[PDB]
């Protein structure tokens, strides 16, 4: 994670992130729409940070300090590079939308009016196929990854010391190995709740209401396809 | 501090997400109520014992039968939620949620929780429910269902006012500590 984006999403809401003189200029319904879009981006930033802890802190640390066999590390962190690629690209598109919407002279005041289109692109065509394929593989390997972690922690002394060392800082409190795996599995089922609530406050422009409606249907088709393609693997 | 895992289950309108948010901040959000809950590790001290209680929500997974059980591995305590303003959510407890939680979490204590107790004497709620020949769930109907499903205990709270919230999570911690 980078300081610029962490500071831009430090506040608990869009209403507390923008200047109060900018907030006063907007209707209550616009503020409600913007608060939900801000939560979607803020939680997408946290999700990409979860994936970076898995690849750079856990996976890479095990390869370079413990000299663990790549086959074992792959079993602990299935599809983390592909997941990182999908969500960093989605996040870049979300943050670019906010950046274009900024008022000149400001790094915090903005209104995002056209999210639906970005959501239709993310959850359709090649990117939707890559999310379905990647999450069907990840979620089928989820139970095996937890069992493999538990076996290593209880039998290898060097592994246990490495875990205790890298998870000691207060910024890793919610992000142990198993916690990261479940945070990733649960991410995809958060999208319909966020999109439905953005849609609830996006009736002002009929084309945006239609775009959000299509995006919601696309996300549900994705989730149904992933759910149908899962079978827990066992070692 | 020992580490324990709590999972909250129940219908989409049972108020499970709001309950996790209000407990983890010790505040009913005064500006924006978040749509989603990611996770949280609560530092709880109950009856002299210090515990790290990891909190998880199942909201959004209700229609996905193969994704939902991935939240269950190594759960130490289940909070099974229903809304007091919704007798229909109490009806889904014994034939839908209870068999699933007993299959994926055998021998794990279940606390049955009646959320939104502040709505029990709300006029709007009593008027709305009467149009479908219903009424807010009575405390004794909650106790009977808890006894029926073999729940560890029965508790009530209101995420809106915070009443009973701390008590639910402290009891859940005690239940997770038992053999
Ligand atoms: C056996 C084991 C290994 C890492 S966590 C854990 C547990 O008991 O939950
Ligand atoms: C998916 C699940 C649910 C309860 S245990 C378990 C596992 O695979 O370890």
From Swiss-Prot, chain A:
Query: DH domain location, by residue?
Result: 32-229
Q: What is known of its domains?
A: The DH (DBL-homology) domain interacts with and promotes loading of GTP on RhoA. Promotes tyrosine phosphorylation of RIPK2.
Spell out the subunit comment.
Found in a complex composed at least of ARHGEF2, NOD2 and RIPK2. Interacts with RIPK2; the interaction mediates tyrosine phosphorylation of RIPK2 by Src kinase CSK. Interacts with RIPK1 and RIPK3. Interacts with the kinases PAK4, AURKA and MAPK1. Interacts with RHOA and RAC1. Interacts with NOD1. Interacts (via the N-terminal zinc finger) with CAPN6 (via domain II). Interacts with DYNLT1.
Protein name from the UniProt record = Rho guanine nucleotide exchange factor 2
Where is the protein situated, by its record's location annotation?
Cytoplasm, Cytoskeleton; Cytoplasm; Cell junction, Tight junction; Golgi apparatus
Give the induction note: Up-regulated by bacterial peptidoglycans stimulation, such as muramyl dipeptide and in biopsies from inflamed mucosal areas of Crohn's disease patients.
The consequence of residue 191 to A is: Reduces phosphorylation level, normal microtubule localization and activity
Range within the parent protein: 206 to 438 of 986
Write down the disease named in this UniProt entry: Neurodevelopmental disorder with midbrain and hindbrain malformations: An autosomal recessive neurodevelopmental disorder characterized by intellectual disability, speech delay, mild microcephaly, midbrain-hindbrain malformations, and variable dysmorphic features.
- Residue positions of the PTM N6-acetyllysine? 150
Q: What does this protein do?
A: Activates Rho-GTPases by promoting the exchange of GDP for GTP. May be involved in epithelial barrier permeability, cell motility and polarization, dendritic spine morphology, antigen presentation, leukemic cell differentiation, cell cycle regulation, innate immune response, and cancer. Binds Rac-GTPases, but does not seem to promote nucleotide exchange activity toward Rac-GTPases, which was uniquely reported in PubMed:9857026. May stimulate instead the cortical activity of Rac. Inactive toward CDC42, TC10, or Ras-GTPases.
Q: Which organism is it from?
A: Homo sapiens (Human)
Swiss-Prot record, chain B:
What are its cofactors?
Mg(2+)
- Tell me which residues bear 5-glutamyl serotonin: 61
User: Which sites bind GTP?
Assistant: 10-17, 28-35, 57-61, 115-118, 158-160
Record note on what altering residue 17 to N does: Decreased Rho protein signal transduction. Decreased substrate adhesion-dependent cell spreading. Decreased stress fibers assembly. Decreased cytoplasmic microtubule organization
Q: Which SMART domains has this protein been placed in?
A: RAB (SM00175), RAS (SM00173), RHO (SM00174)
Task: Spell out the reaction equation it catalyses.
Answer: GTP + H2O = GDP + phosphate + H(+)
Instruction: Tell me what PTMs the record reports for this protein.
Output: (Microbial infection) Substrate for botulinum ADP-ribosyltransferase. (Microbial infection) Cleaved by yopT protease when the cell is infected by some Yersinia pathogens. This removes the lipid attachment, and leads to its displacement from plasma membrane and to subsequent cytoskeleton cleavage.
Please list the residues that carry the modification (Microbial infection) O-AMP-tyrosine: 32
| Molecular function as annotated in GO | G protein activity; GTP binding; GTPase activity; myosin binding; protein kinase binding
Residues annotated as glycosylated: 32, 35
UniProt-annotated location(s) = Cell membrane; Cytoplasm, Cytoskeleton; Cleavage furrow; Cytoplasm, Cell cortex
Record's keyword annotation contains Cell cycle: yes
Which positions bear (Microbial infection) O-AMP-threonine? 35
* The name this protein goes by in its record: Transforming protein RhoA
